[PDB]
């Protein structure tokens, strides 16, 4: 052990920059780490699965939050075929004035990106109607990522 990576002595005893790269590229290869057993193998896999589920819930939670905050969902329900759905808002200090002008679309106050994932149609078809519904789903998934 003694230094990064703590799971590989041969990488830690590398005097070159190769120590860092191989320490990153082999972090999830549990079977190659020092002093690994069948128990520790399945257990690290189990916890990694939970961490992944937490990642997925947090990711979907964030998507709901921006659609409900900077999006068009309430306005898009009224005109499903004439409203460009909004992904989120753009805040880039490198924008020139025309960049702010050309990117302001979908019926928003600032520059926005037009969402192309289809979550607007998905959420309208399953019963979500107001931004309040999207806020509720985001809190639930933020809480699910927590558990």
């Amino acid at each position: 052990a003694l230094r990064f990576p703590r799971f590989s002595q041969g990488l830690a005893q590398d005097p070159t920059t190769r120590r860092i790269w191989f320490g990153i590229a082999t972090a999830h290869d549990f079977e190659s780490h020092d002093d690994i057993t069948e128990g520790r193998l399945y257990q690290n896999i189990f916890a990694s699965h939970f961490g992944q589920l937490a990642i997925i819930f947090l990711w979907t939670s964030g998507n709901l939050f921006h659609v409900a905050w900077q999006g068009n969902f309430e306005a898009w329900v009224q005109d499903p075929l004439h409203v460009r759905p909004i992904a989120h808002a753009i805040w880039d200090p490198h924008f020139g004035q025309p960049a702010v002008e050309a990117f302001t679309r979908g019926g928003a106050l600032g520059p926005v990106n037009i969402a192309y994932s289809g979550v607007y149609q998905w959420w309208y078809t399953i019963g979500l109607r107001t931004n309040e519904d999207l806020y509720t789903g985001a809190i639930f998934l933020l809480f699910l990522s927590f558990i």
Binding site: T16, R18, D92, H94, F95, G96, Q97, P98, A99, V100, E101, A102
Partner: protein
Amino acid sequence: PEVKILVDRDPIKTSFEQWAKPGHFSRTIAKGPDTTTWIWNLHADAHDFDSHTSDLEEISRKVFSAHFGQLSIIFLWLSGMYFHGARFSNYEAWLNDPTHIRPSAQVVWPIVGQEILNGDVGGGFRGIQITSGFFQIWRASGITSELQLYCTAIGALVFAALMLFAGWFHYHKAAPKLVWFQDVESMLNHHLAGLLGLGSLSWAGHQVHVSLPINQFLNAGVDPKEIPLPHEFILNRDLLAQLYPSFAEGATPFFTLNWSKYADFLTFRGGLDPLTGGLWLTDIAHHHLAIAILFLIAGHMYRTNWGIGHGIKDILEAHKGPFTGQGHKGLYEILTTSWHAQLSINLAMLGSLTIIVAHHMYAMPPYPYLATDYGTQLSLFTHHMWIGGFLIVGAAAHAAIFMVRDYDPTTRYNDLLDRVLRHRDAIISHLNWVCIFLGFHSFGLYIHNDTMSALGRPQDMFSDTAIQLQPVFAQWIQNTHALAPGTTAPGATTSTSLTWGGGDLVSVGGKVALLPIPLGTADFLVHHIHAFTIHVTVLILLKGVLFARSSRLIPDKANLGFRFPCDGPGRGGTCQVSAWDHVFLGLFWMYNAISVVIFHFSWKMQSDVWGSINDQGVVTHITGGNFAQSSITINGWLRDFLWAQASQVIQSYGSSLSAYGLFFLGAHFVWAFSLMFLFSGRGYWQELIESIVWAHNKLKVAPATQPRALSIVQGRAVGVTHYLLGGIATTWAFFLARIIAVG
């Protein structure tokens, strides 16, 4: 010590016995193939003479006969060219209307519908438009009828026969001796005065007797059939005096030193002749006369057998200073022992000369009606650029070969080379830093401009309208060139070229020939890109040369040879450490440099020069002067150059240019085909061939010559060969289609 003719008689017998034995030259290859790799080695070591034997005399005689064979093939090629100009061409029709007729010298047979490629070229002719420029050359020389081209083709065939016979003669019969080859002083004397001097004098003699008068009659509008034959200007001098009066004297001012009379046909007016668009033929003849005199004088520097003259050994040894030690002492022994050293020097110089030719022929059109044949000019420029780049990469390769095989400080030492080797590290590190600095401060500017134009900030770009980076030095130089005639060049009537002198726009047949070339921020950025790419190519090749023998990673690299794959996966990995792989990568980088160079040329000429001129003097260029604003951006190069000008090649189907549309995609195909070799390694392919061999052996149909995947070096060679072929042929099809359609 006395230069003289030295040959041996019948050193090698003429027989077909060694024809029937493949790989006879090599001792390991002559046993026949055990595996298929043999078949490749036979071609890879076919011309490696210094690896077949160690006797310098055998090597020199083989090289001499190979030169004769090359000259035979070049003469056969020229015979074919002149014969096609005589038999399957419309040269007589192009001679009457050079501004409307398209030059063509190839007609295809009608078999599978390919007769569509026989397009309407004018003059009642269906064929393939040629861009080699042989029509302009044959007009400048004074050729009019197909009979003269026939006779030139027959003479070239006879000369090819002579060269082939001489190649057989100086290897199988009277084969020269080593000291004969090593008489460098005599050889340089005969090449400066005998070859170049007398050659320039002979061509000046032709130009003052055939080119000038026949071209005067062609400029005057006289019908070529009604033009007197050239030899009629050698009999009745009244004909020569009616065009150039000084010929009425008869070599008397030449001997009496009244040369001021010959200013009628030996002039220094410069610029272009406004009727043809080429340089004044009188100026070209005067030039060849001056070149002849200069070379005839220069061919007397080196001593031979009459005491007077120089010995190159003394001149070398005398040039040593306090920084370089006893420099140059030993170089005369190196350059008289190693063929590869001479080959490196001559490849470097000939390639750079080809590049200089490419520049000088576009900026000073030498042949009549060449400047307006946009296809011919673009093709000549690009072709010469590629020739030069390849030859310089070969110079690098052979320098490395000399380092590996002919370098030995215990026998033929040189202080300069040893000092270079003793700080190769500093040299390479500094070139590396220069390359990084140039990469940031040229391409990084393009990325800056792209990111500013995409963010709606056109004033924060580097442009002629915003943050300007004017090439002040080149502008001042071309201005000084413009003002030189009449000041720092009183004999000159006009500017050296038209790209210098302000005004003086020459146009021929409704199309422009040449005009002053603007230089702005775009030119600055592109020139720095060129410098950067040249520097990186030089870095790769020179680093391969200097580290060919030893390095901190492999201190015995010279024992591994010049061409070896690696030295194992150890030391972290030793792939592509040989100098051969350095040439292999320098090939890609030379391609990457030359491509940007020729694209710069194409866009600049189509934007700021080439175009159509009005009756009142309104010039509209092929592209609407879009070079200043569009070429300062990578997206501009993608859109306003590639996407816009590839239309002709992607629309050529159903016309005579459809062959270019086919070659476009075929070259795309072979370029992507190379990526299979460049991205993979031979172990996987051998493991695949194993199962394939199982399948063959199951049905009693496996070959004795055991199949083997290509070698690592061969993998890289095939990869780079196909990569280069694909890229260059793609650009070739694109350029030719574009310039023949919009030209």
